[PDB]
Ligand binder design. Structure first.
Ligand code: MG
Lengths: 180, 85
């Protein structure tokens, strides 16, 4: 079973620049440790607005995750997570942009959930979304609830705090489910 | 529409400043601050403005107020300048 997985990563100002680097180094760690065909990737940075940093088409082509994210600029403006998800749903998972139609679609959201917009993610229901919480600002009633709002259900199975990447044994042996 | 004040402060390394994000729309759909500094907001009575206290600021920093209004989303930055002791 093929899997289309998209990294939606928080490049808002609320994350330190060293924290941002940690998020890049994280995505690279995941892609490196999944260089089999089954997983096809794509990454979009969100802040005030959204930009896809690479397509599935691009991963399928270049295939070098180091040189694929090598040109990211930390956006450093508001945190518009809600419309960010909607963007991934409608603008990244596409026939034209290299998405496999049969593939079961996954989303990894990395943010502090201090989100600066509101809405609904109905457009991305069928996308199974693990969300992972980094940031000094993810420590509040609101932020936490916001994180769980983005997650698949039941919430406390798709939400974790980034650590110094301990999930690279945890999440991974659960991401080895999807390949079948 | 938002407005932030003070627009620019100077303060000694490890000091603190309160800033005030104020919106024009008088019941803003959402109003807050975006910064990587540590922050704590205050007594609200009313939702036109929040007041955030940025404590123990260590290096030169920025802070950005936003308010999602009927009219749109607005931004306003405030520059914190810190000097050593
Ligand atoms: Mg943020």
């Amino acid at each position: 079973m093929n899997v289309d997985l998209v990294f939606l990563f928080d490049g808002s100002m609320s994350l330190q620049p060293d924290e941002f680097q940690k998020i890049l180094d994280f995505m690279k760690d995941v892609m490196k440790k999944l260089s089999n065909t089954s997983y096809q990737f794509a990454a979009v940075q969100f802040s005030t607005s959204y930009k896809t940093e690479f397509d599935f088409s691009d991963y399928v082509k270049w295939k070098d995750p180091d040189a694929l994210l090598k040109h990211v600029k930390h956006m450093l403006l508001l945190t518009n997570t809600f419309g960010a998800i909607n963007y991934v749903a409608t603008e990244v998972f596409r026939e034209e942009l290299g998405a496999r139609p049969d593939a079961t679609k996954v989303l990894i959201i990395i943010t502090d959930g201090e989100a600066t917009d509101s809405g609904n993610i109905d457009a991305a229901k069928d996308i199974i979304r693990y969300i992972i919480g980094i940031g000094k600002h993810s420590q509040t009633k609101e932020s936490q609830e916001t994180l769980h709002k983005f997650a698949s259900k039941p919430a406390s199975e798709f939400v974790k705090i980034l650590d110094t990447f301990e999930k690279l044994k945890d999440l991974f042996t659960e991401l080895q489910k999807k390949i079948y | 529409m938002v407005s932030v004040s003070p627009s620019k402060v100077t303060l000694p390394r490890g000091g603190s400043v309160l800033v005030t994000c104020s919106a024009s729309c008088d019941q803003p759909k959402l109003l807050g601050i975006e910064t990587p500094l540590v922050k704590k907001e205050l007594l609200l009575p009313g939702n036109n403005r929040k007041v955030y206290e940025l404590s123990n600021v260590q290096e030169d920093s920025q802070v950005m107020c936003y308010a999602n209004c009927p009219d749109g989303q607005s931004t306003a930055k405030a520059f914190l300048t810190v000097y050593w002791t």
